[PDB]
Amino acid sequence: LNGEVLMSDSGSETAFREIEIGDGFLPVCSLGPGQVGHLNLGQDVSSLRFFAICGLQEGFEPFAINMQRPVTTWFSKSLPQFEPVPPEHPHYEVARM
Amino acid sequence: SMLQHLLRRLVFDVPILNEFAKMPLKLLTNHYERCWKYYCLPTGWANFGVTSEEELHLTRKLFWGIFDSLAHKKYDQELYRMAMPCLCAIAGALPPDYVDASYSNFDPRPVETLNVIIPEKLDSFINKFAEYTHEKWAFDKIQNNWSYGENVDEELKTHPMLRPYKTFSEKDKEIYRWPIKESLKAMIAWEWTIEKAREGEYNPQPPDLSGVTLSRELQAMAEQLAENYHNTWGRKKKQELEAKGGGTHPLLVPYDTLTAKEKARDREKAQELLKFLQMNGYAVTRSIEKRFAFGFLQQLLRWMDISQEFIAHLEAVVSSGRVEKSPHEQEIKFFAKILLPLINQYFTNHCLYFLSTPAKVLGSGGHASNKEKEMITSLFCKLAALVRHRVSLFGTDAPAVVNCLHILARSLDARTVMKSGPEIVKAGLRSFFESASEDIEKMVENLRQNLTYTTVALLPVLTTLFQHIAQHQFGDDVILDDVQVSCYRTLCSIYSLGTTKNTYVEKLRPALGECLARLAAAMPVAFLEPQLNEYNACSVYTSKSPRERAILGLPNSVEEMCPDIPVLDRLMADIGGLAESGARYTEMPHVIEITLPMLCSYLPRWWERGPEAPPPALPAGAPPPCTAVTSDHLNSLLGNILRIIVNNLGIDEATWMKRLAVFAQPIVSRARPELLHSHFIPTIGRLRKRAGKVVAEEEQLRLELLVRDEFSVLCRDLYALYPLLIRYVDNNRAHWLTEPNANAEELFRMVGEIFIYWSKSHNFKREEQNFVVQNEINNMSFLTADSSVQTSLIVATLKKMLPIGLNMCAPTDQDLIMLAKTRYALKDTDEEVREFLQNNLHLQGKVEGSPSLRWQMALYRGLPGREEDADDPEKIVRRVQEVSAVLYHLEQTEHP
Prior knowledge:
This is part of a larger assembly, with 2 copies of chain A.
Chain A: no helix or strand
């Protein structure tokens, strides 16, 4: 936060640890009602704040640094639509008699 | 979730406390330590779910049964050794605020009502309601979508005997009224009477619905009526059940104990009868109290009255000899074995909400009850009086008693003790303040057992009260009027003892200094400025008019009451002169233990209420008393530190060294980087300067006791100076990373040299660990900003200063230098790595080697303070060598 590492109650700098890589990770953000926010992936280093304060000399690279075009993003649209019933749905089952 | 039946079986026999009923109580103890959040008013966790609506009240009934069985029982040790922690766990296993939801072997006692003659003056209502019960029974069927059949038939699920009133036989009407007769006789036997206030008296058009609310007492009427219904039902069921001799009905539990889901069977009937009574209009005449929050404290009151009277008897008899047999020795040891553990566990566990108010913003719900916390305040005063000059008289549990009083001192707000509440407890706590200050005055004039009692009970707990008030920022709301006068006189009594130069007082001086510092932080008038105290509204002269000042003979100024405290204008100069001039503890041993305590008192010097920052008290006083800006105090502190440490290196000042390390905590708020450099570089430079010889003398001898002593003071100085340097740059590193500062990189080399010296010197690691355990160093405390250990400061300071030393070096030749540093272990010495420095310049990194190098060099050259002096061939080798060496020792620390 503002170039200062947020502190845990126990006294660990890492918010999470022992994270399995699995299939991968992506940046994500969620906003509540009547909220605005500015997400900076880091296409331009001159527009990145506090990166020099923390991350520059620790070997951390800005997300999408050498990318020529801005990163496309997906949002969860709230328009209801009809979709097939999944076969693994825990509550409903359809039989073809 | 499925052990509630087991608990229902356990409540039958466990409170009886039989010979074999103890192990089930242990099983309850363990099951209650576990699933602790699962039993709670909110939802604990999903590992086993949430408690039912009433299992909390089952726990409550368990606690009360075990408590009453405990009371006035045989005092055998093992009889309750395992069970008192059970009480602790049960008390901590349920919340105090709204302790029970739907409140209100086992033998349900019925009500003897057949013996008494029943009234018949309201038979026009008796018979009418007796018929109306069956009429509403018929009314339920049409809603249930079933017709009423005339003839008796089995296929009709409802009662087929029902008929239209024209062809209806009264043989069943004269027998179905019997439950109604019994209920009316029950009300008659109860203390509640029925008065005909009004003038009056097969499907019923008027409906009887229990979906509307009513008054609390009139709802308690229906609650008690349903309780009578269910205990009569339980008696008539257990009459048949008792022939089995084993097992019990799941619904045989008392009315208050049974779950609310099954309570509806009686509650609906009771509420329907209540609504019928409301329609008639008959007159009936006979919060925090119900909660675990305060009712248990009511029984605590009913306990501590007896406690104080019997301990008064005990002290009287111990003064006039002794008593061969105590009248109530069992009750004497009862509190010492139950109440003290229960108080110091329960209030510890729920102290999160005890200091919470709806005004406050805290996670746990506030008590929102003045009495809830104010009888706790009375308990402070009473417990003080229980041990007032009687701490050793109280018994071997006096340390336990003072610990309980301490955890009591936690969770206090003036909104419950002074700003609101009865004057009796207010005067009690004010009298406690006056008595404590008077005892302090008597001790300090005697020193110019009562002192043992003070130093054991009063001084630590008083310190905790002052610290809690200071941290809670309640100084203005607590320290006022009589409390502020008491604070004045205890303040001036503590410093009055400072003139004494005796020997037995030397050990006490640290505690007096700590308590004086605690009171200084929470002191809301700023007494240090007598000439400006009239502006502040917290002053007794400003708050109380001279007429109000006459009764206690208040002089004109705060200094006039007691001029013991010198004004701030010269006292800071006085210490900044004397400490610099003397520069030794042995030369002036008195001031080292007298002025340094009041220097720690001045340590919480606030400047947010002065010219530097907008004062919160500025509306109260336009010229605020706080008018100090310069950090001359802090730099004088640093100079004194340097002088005294250097002069008395051999002196075993480890205790004052620890106090000095924790001393001067608010450096950052007044941190002036210019003077801080001008003092830190020379100081840490003499420190490492003698550190060079200390390892050197160690090295020559190893190829001993003298060097171990040198490392002893060295390890002392590090842990005594390193904590203050960390905070200085924690908030100044960002500026130096943003714009390179020449001193910043130099200090990186200093800390790196000290660190690598520590990595070379095995016993310096040994003695570092020694002083960790010898001085009980809180190195984790130095790491955590309030805002073997593998957490030493010498390693911490590089994890802290590494970016400063890393952003000065663009070329990545540190890998080849790393190979040279591995050649150190491969038998390449300092001369050989100097040759590698000489050959380093023929291999340098390129901006075209990697795509990331382009933007890295872009930022590096875009730094405003960047210069080619380091890029010059002479300085590049130096900077890369320094970085490589510090990185060496960092990696070898990193490798386990």
